[PDB]
Ligand SMILES: OC[C@H]1O[C@H](O[C@H]2[C@H](O)[C@@H](O)[C@@H](O)O[C@@H]2CO)[C@H](O)[C@@H](O)[C@@H]1O
Ligand SMILES: OC[C@H]1O[C@H](O[C@H]2[C@H](O)[C@@H](O)[C@@H](O)O[C@@H]2CO)[C@H](O)[C@@H](O)[C@@H]1O
Ligand SMILES: [Cl-]
């Protein structure tokens with residue numbers, strides 16, 4: 001079970017958990033309540049397992065797409081901000097955390113992937129995916145590469161897969177049709193085929209993951225990476241002269257990243273719901289609370305209107321929002337976990353050459369629709 | 371082709387490359403010759419590909435096991451230390467880089483994996499692999515795990531596989547029989563099966579890699595990890611109260627890590643062979659040079675006698691040598707790269723459940739021979 005009189009928070013290890021811990025220290029200084037911030041592996045998978053038994057964190061942070069599943073499984077407390085508090089956050093961010101008519105988490109920030117590039121190696125970033133092999137040929141001659149990014153998580157490859165027509169679930173008449181999946185269509189096939197060709201022609205390696213790409217970019221081994229706002233801090237530290245910009249187009253069309261709203265849900269089994277509410281509304285979701293987290297690892301475009309307006313002039317955030325507008329907000333429906341698992345397998349199997357692109361996506365299509 | 375009048379060095383990203391760069395800056399300061407230290411991805415695969423076309427770095431750092439393969443391909447210059455310099459290093463480290471009667475690299479340091487444990491979480495670490503499932507169950511109740519280590523590179527799982535009888539190439543009377551491969555015998559199958567069982571029982575995850583394990587240990591999420599001396603610097607930084615100790619036994623037998631001698635080879639295509647020799651003999655392989663590297667990322671037990679003497683009181687190094695004594699120094703023969711590729715595939719396939727242990731090891735056996 002969950003311990004009373006304190007708060008346990010889970011957040012992913014790529015986020016500003018040290019900053020969040022500082023907000024927690026302030027909370028403790030004011031209320032005497034200890035806040036423990038943890039970053040378990042696979043937390044988005046563990047949470048539903050442990051929460052069902054009445055254990056786990058008081059508060060879970062993740063992108064909003066996971067939350068409908070958690071809500072449908074009875075794992076989340078309905079949140080009860082008054083109208084005054086609601087007015088403090090952008091309406092579209094509340095939309096991301098509304099499920100079956102109820103608010104099931106507090107929205108924190110809007111995230112989208114951008115192209116990040118080393119201005120020393122590449123003063124002019126490429127407008128198109130198609131020119132990346134040419135850039136890589138140039139750079140390979142200097143002992144570098146053009147582009148490295150996490151190929152192990154479909155989140156990162158999705159923008160390209162979606163560009164020419166791939167989609168998750170078709171929206172119609174105000175709801176997602178979970179039986180209409182867009183993962184094995186011509187557009188999705190074109191996008192994944194391009195990625196696989198990049199690997200076949202040795203411009204990328206199938207096993208490149210988050211840490212490998214981050215290392216390479218931050219040590220100037222590769223001219224570009226694809227990543228979210230949380231990654232800017234480590235780049236700052238590495239002293240690389242970087243820019244953040246619109247993702248490359250594919251077949252003349254915008255890459256379409258899936259947009260996540262980082263959100264904080266309260267465990268239905270928590271005996272500290274009021275403390276969790278006070279922490280989130282009166283400490284984290286303030287100018288100063290968001291600053292503490294953002295200073296650790298940037299959040300993106302925060303849900304709090306006041307602080308968002310303050311940071312909006314940041315060109316990196318402008319780029320983030322440009323990419324977000326070109327993409328689509330993720331659904332929060334329970335079927336999303338099945339979608340992501342299916343596409344994850346498809347990309348890994350196609351990238352490694354274990355399956356053809358056609359075979360991989362045909363299977364994912366079926367798997368995603370249950 | 372390689373640029374004349376400078377030095378390009380490749381070394382793995384887990385080593386003290388910044389320390390090495392400092393030795394390089396000292397070289398440039400004294401000679402005007404710029405030294406560029408790089409740490410490319412998959413450099414042990416990269417080097418032979420580019421060196422075959424006469425490009426690549428002037429100097430390549432890797433464990434000695436890969437060097438016999440490079441030499442047979444003609445990718446390395448024979449090196450020419452006088453006897454006075456050779457006597458500066460331990461004969462057994464020179465043995466590791468002797469191929470076809472010739473010295474094909476400079477030995478730098480001796481590496482072996484040890485068990486690293488969080489003293490606060492686990493004051494008395496387990497002596498056996500067999501007690502790990504019960505330890506994990508107890509720690510899981512506390513929100514921790516018992517053990518996380520890199521399951522993606524067979525280097526890290528080899529000690530368990532070799533514990534009860536597994537081996538690469540039969541070594542008899544001072545010679546390796548490249549036809550007598552021990553990767554699919556009862557011992558190796560017992561070892562790998564125990565590993566796969568840990569995963570099946572959720573005590574470990576098949577996808578755990580170097581970064582995941584390092585993060586978990588250095589943030590106190592797991593009580594133990596398995597790693598080499600290069601890892602200690604990041605643990606120091608993390609403030610985890612750690613100890614370095616003997617690997618757990620399996621079926622009553624010591625884990626048997628493959629011991630590596632970090633070594634520096636000179637590209638046969640380098641136009642700077644003399645500069646490279648100078649940098650290596652007169653700058654790197656000195657108490658000051660090695661200290662610079664070691665202070666960045668610990669080297670282990672260095673090949674240079676004088677400096678090894680000076681660091682030998684370090685209990686972490688003593689534990690490293692105790693594990694090394696229980697293991698086996700790697701062969702340097704050309705067949706090693708085939709051996710490693712085959713075993714890596716087998717461990718990953720068995721761990722993921724894509725193939726049975728028996729089938730994975732049988733394929734590796736065939737591929738390695
Ligand atoms: O890759 C599938 C994965 O995508 C998204 O996860 C993102 C997350 O939104 C970001 O905040 C960041 O942490 O990177 C993650 C990808 O590694 C979905 O939110 C997640 O449900 C899904 O499994
Ligand atoms: O995993 C196979 C791999 O094992 C050894 O590589 C070690 C290396 O010796 C250490 O210095 C350290 O870098 O970790 C490596 C494992 O990731 C062999 O030397 C290497 O040939 C082999 O592929
Ligand atoms: Cl819907």
Ligand SMILES: [Cu+2]
Pocket residue numbers: 013038039040041585586589591
């Ligand atoms: Cu963590």
Ligand SMILES: [Cu+2]
Pocket residue numbers: 215216219221383408409410411
């Ligand atoms: Cu590197």
